[PDB]
Write a protein that binds this ligand. Sequence first.
Ligand SMILES: O=C([O-])C(=O)[O-]
Ligand SMILES: O=C([O-])C(=O)[O-]
Ligand SMILES: O=C([O-])C(=O)[O-]
Ligand SMILES: O=C([O-])C(=O)[O-]
Ligand SMILES: [K+]
Ligand SMILES: [K+]
Ligand SMILES: [K+]
Ligand SMILES: [K+]
Ligand SMILES: [Mg+2]
Ligand SMILES: [Mg+2]
Ligand SMILES: [Mg+2]
Lengths: 510, 407, 510, 507
Amino acid sequence: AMADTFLEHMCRLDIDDPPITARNTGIICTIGPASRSVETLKEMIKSGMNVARLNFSHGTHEYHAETIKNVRTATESFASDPILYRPVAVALDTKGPEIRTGLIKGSGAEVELKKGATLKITLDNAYMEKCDENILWLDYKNICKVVEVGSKIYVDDGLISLQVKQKGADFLVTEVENGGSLGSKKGVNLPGAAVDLPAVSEKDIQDLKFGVEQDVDMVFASFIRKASDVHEVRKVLGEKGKNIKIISKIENHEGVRRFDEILEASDGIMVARGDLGIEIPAEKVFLAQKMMIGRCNRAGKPVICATQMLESMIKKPRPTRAEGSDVANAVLDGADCIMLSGETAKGDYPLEAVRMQHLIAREAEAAIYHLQLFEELRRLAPITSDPTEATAVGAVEASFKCCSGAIIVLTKSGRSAHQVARYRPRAPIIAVTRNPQTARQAHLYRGIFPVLCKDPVQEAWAEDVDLRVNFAMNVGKARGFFKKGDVVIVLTGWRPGSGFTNTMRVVPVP
Amino acid sequence: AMADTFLEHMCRLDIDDPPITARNTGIICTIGPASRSVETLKEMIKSGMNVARLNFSHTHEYHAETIKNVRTATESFASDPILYRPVAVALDTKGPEILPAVSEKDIQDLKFGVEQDVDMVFASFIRKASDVHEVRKVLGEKGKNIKIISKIENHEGVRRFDEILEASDGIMVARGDLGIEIPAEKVFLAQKMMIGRCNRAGKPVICATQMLESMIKKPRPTRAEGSDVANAVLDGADCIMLSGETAKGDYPLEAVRMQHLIAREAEAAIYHLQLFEELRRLAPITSDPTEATAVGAVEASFKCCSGAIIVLTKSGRSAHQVARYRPRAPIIAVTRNPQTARQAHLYRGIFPVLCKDPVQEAWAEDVDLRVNFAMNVGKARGFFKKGDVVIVLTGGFTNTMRVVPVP
Amino acid sequence: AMADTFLEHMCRLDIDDPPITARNTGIICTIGPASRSVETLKEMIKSGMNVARLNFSHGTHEYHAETIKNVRTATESFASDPILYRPVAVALDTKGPEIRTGLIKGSGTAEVELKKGATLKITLDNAYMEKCDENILWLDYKNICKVVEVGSKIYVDDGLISLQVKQKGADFLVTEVENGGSLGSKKGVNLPGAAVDLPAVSEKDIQDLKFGVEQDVDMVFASFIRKASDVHEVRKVLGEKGKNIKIISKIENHEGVRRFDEILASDGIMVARGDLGIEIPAEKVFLAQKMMIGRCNRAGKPVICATQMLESMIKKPRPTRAEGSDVANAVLDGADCIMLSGETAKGDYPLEAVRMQHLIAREAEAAIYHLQLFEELRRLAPITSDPTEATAVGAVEASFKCCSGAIIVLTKSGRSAHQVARYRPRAPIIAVTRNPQTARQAHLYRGIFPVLCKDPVQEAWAEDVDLRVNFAMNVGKARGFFKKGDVVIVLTGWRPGSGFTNTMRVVPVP
Amino acid sequence: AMADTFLEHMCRLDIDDPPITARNTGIICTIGPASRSVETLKEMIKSGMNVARLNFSHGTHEYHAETIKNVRTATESFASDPILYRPVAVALDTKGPEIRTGLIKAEVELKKGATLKITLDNAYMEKCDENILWLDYKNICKVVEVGSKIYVDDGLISLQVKQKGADFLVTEVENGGSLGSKKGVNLPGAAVDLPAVSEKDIQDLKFGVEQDVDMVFASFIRKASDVHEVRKVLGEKGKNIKIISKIENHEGVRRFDEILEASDGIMVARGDLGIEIPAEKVFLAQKMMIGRCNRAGKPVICATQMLESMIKKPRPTRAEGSDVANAVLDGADCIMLSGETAKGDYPLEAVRMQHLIAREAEAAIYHLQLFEELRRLAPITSDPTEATAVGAVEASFKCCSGAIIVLTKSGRSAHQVARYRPRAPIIAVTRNPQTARQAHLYRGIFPVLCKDPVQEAWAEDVDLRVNFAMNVGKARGFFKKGDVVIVLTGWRPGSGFTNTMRVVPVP
Ligand SMILES: O=C([O-])C(=O)[O-]
Ligand SMILES: O=C([O-])C(=O)[O-]
Ligand SMILES: O=C([O-])C(=O)[O-]
Ligand SMILES: O=C([O-])C(=O)[O-]
Ligand SMILES: [K+]
Ligand SMILES: [K+]
Ligand SMILES: [K+]
Ligand SMILES: [K+]
Ligand SMILES: [Mg+2]
Ligand SMILES: [Mg+2]
Ligand SMILES: [Mg+2]
């Protein structure tokens, strides 16, 4: 990042200059049958998984309870050594207002819709398991009240398109535009219709209540379109779930247009590109992506790039060039986390997909033009009387000045570490906490390596601080972030409890 | 653009702001069984193909007929020079495919390329300067004006890159073998490095391979594919390429249309305020009047938000010089040399137009007729409309810039 | 300007690097008894004078008519060679609302000495108008009793003597000497904290401005402008006959600085530091200077830095270090012209003062950080449909790209040359005009070398353009600006008359 | 510094926007007949003097010893009270290789075109007149030639060498005027061979060590060894004495970098400099040196004729007010008064004016660009103190703190903060008296001498000094209770470096 121009910075990128050990971008993995086993989850963790996502679009509460137990069992298998122990977060991703088709008729396995053929859509439950090439059932009872003749209707990842020609009280007559093979229970998208399904349905409420009961760390709330949607999710989690982070998934045109009010009410954002690239033209997704990462970076709030990042690894052991590009560019954009969906839930190469993201994220982070980034984050940040905030930016500046091996942060809520991550140091942030939930939610922020201290509280505040600082030193040495010869930054408070971070030291590693 | 910072530039990206109708990034399509027919080539031109790529990695009689179908489809529109879109022809070698810098079979394809009047050659597995020299020595004096584009597909070619760029007319980032030759996670570094240096030197760079891979079988690309095309344009790739997507896949027209749509949206999103500043800062003081005029016109086009920069040019050089400075505005290059007009597609933002009118005896009348030709092109293609402001560059050098209304 | 930061640009300044032949900053010389002879004026033109300033605070119309005649006689003594002819402007500087004391007592020493704490009576009684002394002081502001308040401070003689008002009275005020010193005759009086009710444009000023129109002056330096309406009264007086006379508003009090934006209504600005640093605290003047120069640069309007720039050269043949610095820094600030007053009107070394301002201006111009200045003037200037503006910025960019020997501009009103100067090329701007007044007014703009083409109008437009272009080419070679085989930028229009500059050429010097 | 461009920053300058209280730029006053008495020296400290300059071109050790004693008397008159106590440094300005004429016949007028013989025969040494001038440069005839120009009395009088002899040269008056006694002589272009460190210099320099001076201003430094010579004479007894090389000739400018590398600081000595090189080039030399000294983190002083007209007048010229402002905008750590305070009629007015202008200028600095460029030009470090300092200045802007409080023994740590040019004042708490006086060489360092005894428990002693700074800042109107300030201390006792930054409210 020594070059005086971004262009010169590009020219100096060198594929033979190896990156640093520490990978800063968090990796979110969707758990499914391919990755649900305790054995596999241990290897997922080893490979670099930081957050387990449980897609409540499918599966019972008993099923997800079991996955959650396997995740925690895999995770606590490493707990015997707190110096190498890596916290793993659990994320609930709601179903939300999904539209799906019914089952293909048992006669059949899948029907071919061919270009220009007619297809009837009905809401008569007699066909809900008898779908075929002439009659398609779906589960949105009021689909007729929201579409008109000429409307487009999209089916199965937007790969099949239908145009309404007749619009009836019970039925719709459609003309197959782009045809293909149609299976069972495929997603339906109605872009540019005013879909009246609730943001938080009754299933979502029970799912969210269940989330609080199983002590999940965060919620990925589907199809958020306005701030009041976020507030309903918040109300459901209630007082008991007040510490669970709400990550609004931006997946439709309205979500993008009202992004600022959604951002202000949310704890973070996911750029949910799968649905988003069907609700809005596929050529516009990258615009929406870079806008949202930029604004979250500017707000200091976590943002997740999601969906089809390594899609071909569902079936192949190495990704496409486009897919390698896309993961790098999400990190360069400024994403706090990258995510995997089918690639880990259902694919033939779950571990290969995690490892590839780990490799690309680390190459991309060394390619960041920190000179310009740190300069602009500072220019867009407000002036304030916050001791923690002035301490965090001081520490980041100092970390650049001595190319520190890490920035060590004692934090109870995680906030002090979040305030450091918002200014994007090159150096990893080792966040020492005794709060296990804090160590799991730390993964939402770029660069925070959360380590969980289980030593007793020391009576003398000074001795307690030194204990946790020394703990971070050993973690740093053990994982190879620095050695005894190096300099590190250390952020500590003047008294116990949240809100008291006001001290930055520059210390040689002992 | 405007915002004082790149970060605020990003925050202001607006999905509902439609882009200017002119698409600056060239689209290179590999022709194969899915695309070799005259009827679909006509539709590939209409959907936005600018360069037909012919992969000699697989008989000369087969390629001669594909080449004939391309020219047939191309001149199918020649009835009208105001709407005629030139299409170039590219020969891609096999190289060492399972070693000789240039093969014996490559020497036969290259010589076959000259006889077929190909506009450019994509040279596979270029590893050093001497490798290009062997290709240009084989192209000889007949293919003197064939543009040579070294494909960087190997570690050494990356390692010896500066050599190769100097010895070449352009570069292709050939990621499919590059991604097996070097670790896949390092390819974005090589891609962005090479595009940066090509942008710095004013030499064309193609970003190639797997950009819309999943459209070989599907009618819509993945989210990562859409991102890859956009980011290649934001890197500065003069052209983006399709290989299997148009050569053999089930949706060749769909692949072309999508690269057109994405490239256009990405061009709208380029942070011109910074890019123009850095290209200028990084480019040397010159005594060449055409170079001084070129950056003067680009600066003028930003100041007045010109509908276009019209460049009268014969060898294309004058127009290339404008394009390296990356105006937002389309560069309408007017030329009588058909090969110049075909080859222009290798430079971002050059919309070539071929004048078929006879020379007027008076140089002034001749200049004005060609300029009026560009005016009609831009009115018809919707680049600008009557009463808009445009930039006109005319002449042994294009040294004169005029700021004129659109009549 | 090749360094990537301003700090590194300073570090690279080099006293052994000689500067380009052409000096861009105009030099305005106040004409008085030291300088009003035809022979001395000739040497002042050879020494670098571009504008003759006539201070109508003193002298009769007959006196000033003679000066003006002598200026034109010396200027036209060079007219036989149009290649070398330097146009020379004439400026009328108004008296404005001046307050002066009377004449000292004849019997006492030419100067009476006032001592700290003494009493001094100020009177309007005309029997004392030529009998001022250390006890009683006449002055010519008949209304000063109405607008001065007890406790307010009165300043006399370039703000060197200060008085504190003690008692008000009928046709008098009783004051106590705060800062003493020697007091002479007809010294200027400042009342910084009064609502001085003298007319913005007095009857004397109206007579003087009509006489300026009669004498064909090029510009008016309007004294003590406080508001836009003041400028409009000056412009009404000049009327239709003087409609082409440039009005330069002198900013010399607090209200003028306060209402600067509305005043800048004007064609240009003078920073009149003499009265300014008495009307406001002297430590604050450089703030006012840098503010006004910056806003005039951003507006594209001429700004003059004036007064005491080389004051010690009134009596000494070389200046103080502070004076060398002030001139250089006025040019680095962005000032279009620098000015001399007593140094050329009444001092012992008028010629040496002109040559020093020439020497310093030239060195400072090579020290401007053009890389930053061009970038910022562009960024702050509006987008435009104007073909001439787009052509001008394009010429300045091209002139930087080929390090051109000059930008040749054909112009009738001046404005095409003005529009180029606004973006501050390093290269000189040779403005070829047939309009003598345009040639004289061009000196108000940084970097414009005006040349007056005497050749008859050629029948065809293209022929006529090529003549004037070749005239500019011969001017540049004869004056040492460029030589054959160098490259220059040439700006010409598509049609005779003002407003049609569109055309920019990069052409070798034949 | 909130404007996106320097141009917009200029346009937003506002004369009705009052400055902050603390003045960051140091003021160096030449003490002489006008300013020697204990009474006015006191009023000079109250008016803003920080460094007392003693010019050993003139005067005897005894005279200067009495000057030094009157400086220490006024300064300690305030010592009763360490909260308000302002330390005052003492600087010794060497004579150097000065060429001076003899005693006339007491002035003598001289006219252009006339002849003037200059002799080295020490007989006419006290019989100088319109026909024969005597000067003390014994090799002058070796180092000038027929056609050379010679300047006398601050470059006002000029002569041209028409005939050369053994002990003489025959010259024609180029610019005349009232010649006088013992005036100064310059030979621009003449390769003068006089020694950099003279015999009298060694005596004067040894005299400075015994008088406990804080810094030497070494005249006419031409090369690195010259600084090495001044340093060797100061020896181990005076190893803690800062050597400021005075740049006042063409070779000093050409050889500036190696002189900077060898010195503790630089003075831009514009008087001789603007005679040795063309006056229109002085501003380039001044901006070059202040920039390179800013880059390197070493103090730089802008001196000579900043307020020259105030020697006789109570108000300065517009050019002088602008010169002081622009020196501060250039980057200078201190500005200087010479004749204005040593012999003139208004030395308290001059000190006060330099205080007033410097304050308004520091308020006008475009910190946004300045801080960004100082970092980009400063190298990556492994020193904890250095990274802590830049981190503290970054924190400074982030919370716009009242001050950066630095505990420091040698001063170093406060110097490392200062080089990054924070807007907030740096209150450097020290128990070392020499450290507290020398700190004035560095822009922004408001030094305070803690006199309370050491406390046994280190963290008790640290807090003692910290709360001293708090009272200091609250009393001098820098901040008020509740304001945020930055505090730089050590971490572990005896660590030797200042690697701890805390963001605390003022108690
Ligand atoms: O729900 C999602 O994550 C999506 O659509 O990408
Ligand atoms: O050969 C190629 O084009 C490649 O590997 O990308
Ligand atoms: O009138 C003036 O020129 C002044 O006050 O400086
Ligand atoms: O010695 C000095 O101070 C000078 O020459 O300016
Ligand atoms: K879901
Ligand atoms: K999934
Ligand atoms: K006046
Ligand atoms: K001296
Ligand atoms: Mg979705
Ligand atoms: Mg005035
Ligand atoms: Mg000296």
